[PDB]
TrEMBL record, chains A, B, C:
Residues 24-269 form the Nucleoside phosphorylase domain. It catalyses: 2'-deoxyguanosine + phosphate = 2-deoxy-alpha-D-ribose 1-phosphate + guanine; 2'-deoxyinosine + phosphate = 2-deoxy-alpha-D-ribose 1-phosphate + hypoxanthine; guanosine + phosphate = alpha-D-ribose 1-phosphate + guanine; inosine + phosphate = alpha-D-ribose 1-phosphate + hypoxanthine. The keyword Glycosyltransferase applies. PANTHER family: METHYLTHIOADENOSINE/PURINE NUCLEOSIDE PHOSPHORYLASE, PURINE NUCLEOSIDE PHOSPHORYLASE-RELATED. Hypoxanthine binds at residues 199, 241. It comes from Schistosoma mansoni (Blood fluke). It holds the Pfam family PNP_UDP_1. This is Purine nucleoside phosphorylase. Gene3D superfamilies: Nucleoside phosphorylase domain. Pathway: Purine metabolism; purine nucleoside salvage. The purine nucleoside phosphorylases catalyze the phosphorolytic breakdown of the N-glycosidic bond in the beta-(deoxy)ribonucleoside molecules, with the formation of the corresponding free purine bases and pentose-1-phosphate. Belongs to the PNP/MTAP phosphorylase family.
Length: 281, 281, 281
């Protein structure tokens, strides 16, 4: 189905009936980075499959729930099981959950992901506050907004110059300084590789030439839908590896190594985002 | 429907019956740049919806007519309401009107567009004669010619090295010199961003590194279909803003600002293209 | 149909019944470079159209056979008539023949193609051993693996850092040295342009900036499917022209010139690959 006003409204109606929560913060967590969702207070778990007009996710399988409740005195909604465009989902399937968040009252969206490091200053286990992006699918006619514009949500031609809110980046850094882990925290430009193959050694070298700091396979589609409909965004990458160093040393990249870095930083990222949610203006 | 010989022929038959004009020049005008079409002499206006096999355009809405008549003693056909790939149109839907122009007798196609400036010499209100392009959708398997080749129109593997005719660029500059506005006229390479989001600040910085002078969301698909079937092309960008300066100063890009630049230069561009049409060899 | 385990198995069953050959080497030859297939010993020719679940190729036309038999004492399977993504084939249609090769027992895949030269050291008639690639369709959400993962063949996120086997590159060079044509043999990075338009002069200049040595419209999709399911690869480009020199001298690129270079080097490439097959570990 199309991610239009009528269809998003039907989904929001169901969610309001079942949860009673009206959230103003949304969260989408990266692979291995979802522990925070398990400590949402007075929570309600809603499988995607039960929600009218939500995308069908059974071919990919694995978890897919919307979770509503309270964190740090704030009302939130989380996507537990994020949708990736490398699975074959359409623009409409990716956009509809974000537009439902908008109708529910979400004004701030917090996002984490796992990424490869390109900038030579980045090590495995570092965090990058994303300050801009290079959208290779968008340049090449696979932008998430290709299709008719849904005018009720936003304009035909959105500006992305302020997609990554500067005050939210400053708050995230202040909290890292308060807890003495600011030495892990950088800022940078995110390249979107559609995937699902990891960036090749020579693609990584190209990205270094083009001013990219990190590369991954998510996040930019959701940011664009959120910016289109006026939702503020903070996005943070966890660095799994430095792809430029790996190319110079003939070291492989693999999913098991990536998930082990996620497990090593999961509890610190949970603590960090809990405080961010508590402190949001 | 497919943009094949049979289907294009049916459309041309209808158009010949209704207009009696056999044009040898075609024009496609950019957003806010179509005033010239209103002064076509002894004209005939044909809504796309009435023409057999023309693409359906009702989801996007707004004007969509073919207009035939005379300008400066020359017989022309204009597209009033251009089709953009960011609306979701297929390769076949974009190509069919250009191939109908070919069957009607068109030998020269003139095109205008609105673009962002990348080269630091470019200011809002400048004109760029396009001398080559960088086709990000084509590199990434969304070229307008992906699909079976329609052999009656052109070859399986076209060469684009002479897509932008050099003598037509020289004529356009000569006319600007005659009317003392050559100080507005540059030449440059056009990057095709599929869109519909404006180029991000970091995408603009990448394009500067890669030798692009201007960036926009149109024009290259029509140029490729015209070059494939042997139609000569002149393409001219109107610069709405300098995206590199805007990124350095945190200034936004938006559709209202773009259209105001179009209105400021519309009458000069109308005068210029009228003389070009009159003077074509 | 989907390039899944069940459908590939049905195709392999038919092929085993009809040919009696169990190959451990596969070959895919470039345009004008297929003479070797005509000297396969005790061969069996199987039109694609006869094989269950093979992709339909009648719109494009021209030859499309699987050929099995012996070369140099080794059992091989060849694709005579390769599938190109610029024809409009889906990811599933490209992948299924490679996955059938895997089920038949193929462990090594040898590939040739025609390419444009970017590196200034490359001349018409040179050979390039491919050591890595830049996948513009993959960066832009048209990777051959976009879709559900077929877990029986390989992992959700493959690593491509060793897609081009180093020992096979060394064997190919050793044989060129033995026959005194090593002066023709370079190594380099392959850029995948989806096509079917030749790279424009300004796209070629961009590729020079980005560290590409050669550019073409094939090969990378098949390499990715082979690497995903554990098949070793050697890929060799024949240089048709130097696109950077042609842009500086305003010289055109065309299919007839390309095929004439293929004819000039066909017999040497046949001799070379026959010895490679004979000598494989």
């Amino acid at each position: 189905v199309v991610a239009n006003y009528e269809n998003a409204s039907m989904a929001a109606d169901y969610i309001k009936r079942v949860s009673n929560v009206l959230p103003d913060i949304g969260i989408i967590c990266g692979s291995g980075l979802g522990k925070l969702i398990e400590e949402i207070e007075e929570r309600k778990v809603i499988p995607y499959i039960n929600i009218p007009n939500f995308p069908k996710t059974t071919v990919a399988g694995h978890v897919g729930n919307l979770v509503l409740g309270s964190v740090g005195g704030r009302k939130i909604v989380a996507m537990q099981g994020r949708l990736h465009m490398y699975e074959g989902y359409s623009n409409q399937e990716i956009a509809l959950p974000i537009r439902v968040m908008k109708l529910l009252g979400v004004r701030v969206l917090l996002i984490t992901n796992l990424a490869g490091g390109i900038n030579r200053k980045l090590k495995s286990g570092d965090f990058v506050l994303i300050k801009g992006h290079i959208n290779f699918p968008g340049l090449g006619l696979n932008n998430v907004l290709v299709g008719p514009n849904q005018d009720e949500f936003g304009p035909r031609f959105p500006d992305l110059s302020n997609a990554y809110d500067r005050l939210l980046q400053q708050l995230a850094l202040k909290i890292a300084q308060e807890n003495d882990f600011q030495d892990l925290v950088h800022e940078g430009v995110y390249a979107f590789n559609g995937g699902p193959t990891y960036e090749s050694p020579d693609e990584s070298n190209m990205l270094l030439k083009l001013g990219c700091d990190v590369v991954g396979m998510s996040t930019v589609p959701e940011v664009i839908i959120a910016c289109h409909c006026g939702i503020k965004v903070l996005a943070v990458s966890l660095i799994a590896n430095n792809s430029i160093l790996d190319a110079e040393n003939d070291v492989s990249i693999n999913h098991e190594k990536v998930l082990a870095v996620a497990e090593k930083r999961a509890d610190l990222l949970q603590m960090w985002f809990k405080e961010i949610i508590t402190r949001l203006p």
